[PDB]
């Protein structure tokens, strides 16, 4: 169809910021894998940049909603970082 993924992204974003995500958990993809499965590398190969935390033991302690949008430019933005544009993906991991 046309504009389904970006539309639901807006819905997810709208549901994300006003914490009432109990109504949510609506259709979307959830990533499940062992610590040794290397699921982090798969995601990093999608973006084409390293931006996920690395360290001994589990580093991901919060559910990460990763919304990928095709664009000519390359940057990232956090909802809790209103208006700020990240161009350094090494800064992105540190922010997470």
What sign has the CA pseudo-torsion 79, 62, 30, 53?
A: positive
73 is in an annotated binding site: no
12 is in an annotated binding site: no
55 is in an annotated binding site: no
Determination method here? X-ray
Closest residue by Cα to residue 87 from 75, 96, 77, 78: 75
- Reported resolution, Å: 3.7
41 is in an annotated binding site: yes
72's torsion region: left (phi>0), alpha (psi -120 to 50) or beta?
alpha
CA distances from 31 to 4, 21, 40, 83 (A): 20, 18, 10, 28
22's torsion region: left (phi>0), alpha (psi -120 to 50) or beta?
alpha
């Amino acid at each position: 169809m046309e504009e389904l993924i970006p539309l639901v992204n807006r819905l997810q974003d709208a549901f994300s910021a006003l914490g009432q995500s109990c109504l949510l958990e609506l259709p979307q993809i959830a990533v499940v894998g062992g610590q040794s499965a290397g699921k982090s590398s798969v995601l990093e190969n999608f973006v084409g940049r390293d931006f996920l935390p690395r360290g001994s033991g589990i580093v991901t302690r919060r559910p990460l909603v990763l919304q990928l949008v095709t664009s000519k430019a390359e940057y990232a933005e956090f909802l809790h970082c209103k208006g700020k544009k990240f161009t350094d993906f090494d800064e992105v991991r540190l922010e997470i």
